[PDB]
A paper describes a structure:
A member of the TetR family of transcriptional regulators, QacR is a dimer composed of nine alpha helices in which helices α1-3 comprise the helix-turn-helix (HTH) containing DNA-binding domain connected via helix α4 to helices α5-α9, which form the dimerization and multidrug-binding domain. QacR represses transcription of the qacA multidrug efflux transporter gene by binding as a pair of dimers to the IR1 DNA operator sequence, a large inverted repeat that overlaps the qacA promoter (PqacA). Drug binding occurs with a stoichiometry of one drug per QacR dimer and elicits a coil-to-helix transition of residues T89 through Y93 in the ligand-bound subunit resulting in the expulsion of Y92 and Y93 from the interior of the protein and the formation of the multidrug-binding pocket. The QacR multidrug-binding pocket contains two distinct but partially overlapping binding sites designated the rhodamine 6G (R6G) and ethidium (Et) sites after their respectively bound drugs.
Numbering used by the authors:
A (entry chain B): 1 to 163, 165 to 187
B (entry chain A): 3 to 187
């Protein structure tokens, strides 16, 4: 509906620019020329709207990587390439601040917390594959891929989120990191 | 004095967070007025930044003290990372800082002042690596880039690790430290 995807996009950008709390359902309903009833009928609650957006963001990113990893022969390159993509992509990573702001608040309520761990698993799994495969084709030796994946992901999210900033300078930084990390596995 | 408003402000931010905390509450509980506040700290965000600075100073003190127990710079690195994780695990202001950051991490006035604050945390890393270069523990050409990489990555691990059990968090953080220094060699 031109009244469904209409509110989804407005919510996305707002959550990206002002975070979760600052973004009120009212303003969303405002800039998206709709009613509190529409938002309600389509998303019920504000927190529900946010999880749906995270659900979509997770898919897009998943698809984008699914078709981008092919361009990298060795997993060592898929590592470099994945980290660089997370810098330029428009999916998921641009919403980290809001995600953490949301996670910390409703982490007690296990209802939606469970939902986020599910979204948290996929975003991590990407690294799992890279390292698991790297083991199979003898590119490196990692006894605990689960630990290395978690470390890599969060470490990277850190560079992406905490580092306007010159897009080229960021990539050189991300590559440097990528190099240092992989040479540490060896 | 102006210390009264700051004291109360931190408590409210700790208790109810940054967004829920209004300048009004800070006013009445401090026996002051919105006027005297606008005078001393201009805006709310500026007050919160004034509290973070003071906090940073306390952090420097903690580091200044704790760091003397790490003989080599390679040990300081491990220590600094683990200490960030644990200290921030039970640090009250954490949630309030999370909100503020995710809110004003895109404001020319507050961003410049924010980066200046984060840079002091990053600079700790600059010392360790520079000292390490001299002390023959390693050899890093661009310390500035490497310190930013270490700092933001460590912060990532500390911030996005949605996993529980503090025992596991320290393990992963120690592992990162090993992996990271192992790659600088
Ligand atoms: C929680 C404060 N804080 C921030 C920080 C995060 C967001 C805004 C400002 C500073 C930080 C930011 C970067 N990049 C690197 C290290 C730290 C850090 C390190 C230790 C600590 N004990 C607090 C730390």
């Amino acid at each position: 509906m031109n009244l469904k995807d209409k509110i989804l996009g407005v919510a996305k950008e707002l959550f990206i620019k002002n975070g979760y709390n600052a973004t009120t359902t009212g303003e969303i309903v405002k800039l998206s020329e709709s009613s509190k009833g529409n938002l309600y009928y389509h998303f019920k609650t504000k927190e529900n709207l946010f999880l749906e957006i995270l659900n979509i963001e997770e898919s897009k990113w998943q698809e984008q990587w699914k078709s981008e990893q092919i361009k990298a022969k060795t997993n060592r390159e898929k590592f470099y390439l994945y980290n660089e993509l997370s810098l330029t992509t428009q999916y998921y990573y641009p919403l980290q601040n809001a995600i953490i702001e949301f996670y910390t608040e409703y982490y007690k309520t296990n209802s939606i917390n469970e939902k986020m761990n599910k979204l948290e698993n996929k975003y991590i799994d990407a690294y799992h594959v890279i390292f698991k495969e790297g083991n199979l084709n003898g590119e490196w030796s990692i006894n605990d891929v689960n630990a290395v994946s978690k470390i890599a992901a969060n470490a990277v999210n850190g560079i992406v989120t905490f580092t306007e900033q010159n897009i080229n300078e960021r990539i050189k930084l991300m590559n440097k990191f990528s190099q240092i990390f992989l040479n540490g596995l060896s």
